[PDB]
From a paper:
Here, we report that the zinc metalloprotease T3SS effector proteins GtgA, GogA, and PipA from S. enterica cleave a subset of NF-κB subunits comprising p65, RelB, and cRel, whereas NleC from EPEC/EHEC cleaves all five NF-κB subunits. GtgA, in both its apo-form and in complex with p65, has a globular structure, with the catalytic core assuming a Zincin-like fold. The active-site helix (αG) sits at the bottom of a cleft formed between an upper NSD and a lower CSD. Similar to NleC, the active-site cleft of GtgA is highly negatively charged, and the active-site cleft mimics the shape of the DNA major groove.
To prevent cleavage of p65 by GtgA during crystallization, GtgA was inactivated by mutating the glutamate residue in the HEXXH motif to a glutamine (E183Q). GtgA(20–228)E183Q–p65(20–188) crystals belong to space group P212121 with a single heterodimer in the asymmetric unit (a.u.). Residues 20–27 and 137–145 and the C-terminal residue Asn-228 are not visible in the electron density of GtgA(20–228)E183Q nor are the two C-terminal residues of p65(20–188) (residues Arg-187 and Ala-188). GtgA interacts with the p65 NTD via a large interface with a buried surface area of 1081 Å2. Most of the residues in p65 that interact with GtgA, including the p65 cleavage site, are in the loop connecting strands β1′ and β2′, with secondary binding interactions represented by the positively charged surface of the loop connecting strand β7′ and helix αA′ in p65 and the negatively charged surface of the loop connecting helices αC and αD in GtgA. The αF helical segment present in the GtgA apo structure is invisible in the electron density of the GtgA–p65 complex. Despite the absence of the active-site zinc atom in the complex structure of GtgA–p65, the carbonyl oxygen of the P1 residue Gly-40 is positioned above the zinc-coordinating site, hydrogen-bonded with GtgA His-182 and Asp-193. The P1′ residue Arg-41 inserts into the negatively charged S1′ pocket formed by the N-terminal portion of the upper rim and the right wall of the active-site cleft. The side chain of p65 Arg-41 is sandwiched by hydrophobic contacts in between the aromatic rings of Phe-131 and Phe-174, with its guanidino group directly hydrogen-bonded to the side chains of GtgA Asp-155, Glu-163, and Ser-179. Within the active-site cleft of GtgA, the backbone of p65 Glu-39 is hydrogen-bonded to the backbone of Thr-133 of GtgA, whereas its side chain forms hydrogen bonds with the side chains of GtgA residues Gln-192 and Asp-193.
Numbering used by the authors:
A (entry chain B): 28 to 136, 146 to 227
B (entry chain A): 19 to 186
The structure:
Amino acid sequence: FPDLPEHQDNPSQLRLQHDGLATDDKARLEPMCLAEYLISGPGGMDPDIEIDDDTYDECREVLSRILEDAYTQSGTFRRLMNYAYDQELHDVEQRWLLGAGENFGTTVTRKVIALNLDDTDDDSIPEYYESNDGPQQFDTTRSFIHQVVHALTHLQDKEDSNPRGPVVEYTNIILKEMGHTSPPRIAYEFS
Amino acid sequence: AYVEIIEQPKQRGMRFRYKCEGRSAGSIPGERSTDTTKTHPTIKINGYTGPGTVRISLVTKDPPHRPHPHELVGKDCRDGYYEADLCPDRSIHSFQNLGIQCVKKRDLEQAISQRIQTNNNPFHVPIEEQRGDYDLNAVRLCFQVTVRDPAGRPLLLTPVLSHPIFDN
Ligand SMILES: [Cl-]
Ligand SMILES: [Cl-]
């Protein structure tokens, strides 16, 4: 499977074995239905707290575009999505809650995917990741794909003896396959 | 000697996080942060140089500053507070890995009891005080610096509280 030069020297060992299971890179799902396949309805990390119906539509619209682009452009992403569809997403009652407007996150260890559009918001300070070209700002595409990759693989960023982990490496590869210009993320935490 | 906050945490723009897999371990930005140069909360120790400890904990916005049910998380954090050795050869200290993790409303009493069990109570607020409503949208950073007296015995300096940090 395609990989990056920034990985192949000490590549993630957890991604490489999830690849052993996600092998169908074919474009057999319809891109404009991926959002419905992934998201059931609004719902935040906290049951008691509730999501704004308006921000839900805003975030879902953006999420749908990114899912569509990633599936049409990235064979690596088609593998994760296809596999996930066969296991759970085909079931209307196995889908994720979209915690729109909440801090980026997804429940891995009730299933929630928390996304927001603050990456485009002046009033927030950018958050950064480490690359060979110096610190890079997180953008919507990377943040959305990173959280979605969590939800399609059920994997964590914590990998013993790998500075990136499986989700970062997947995200790096998918974004490059999408024509995303951002430098790949060489480490999960700074140093 | 006394502690001085020379870079306050930024009050707004950063959401408290939950227990989940995120994109990164966030760092509370400093008040002077921009899209060009992000900053981090920073303190200065006046009148003392040498080894020491600093603990950072969360307390309520209004006095009496009870220990907040939320947690600080990130490098060198445990049981909801940050604690690490001071660089012994500097008087300026920045904290670039601070994160705020909010407790679910249903686990509030559980968090408060952990604050008590772990002796995380900067202003020694009585137990009978630590019930009632908490503002889960706002917290203050409490910097508790321990330096040394001339004989090398630990000497706790007066705590200093930051501006409030809001979730929205
Ligand atoms: Cl950052
Ligand atoms: Cl990433």
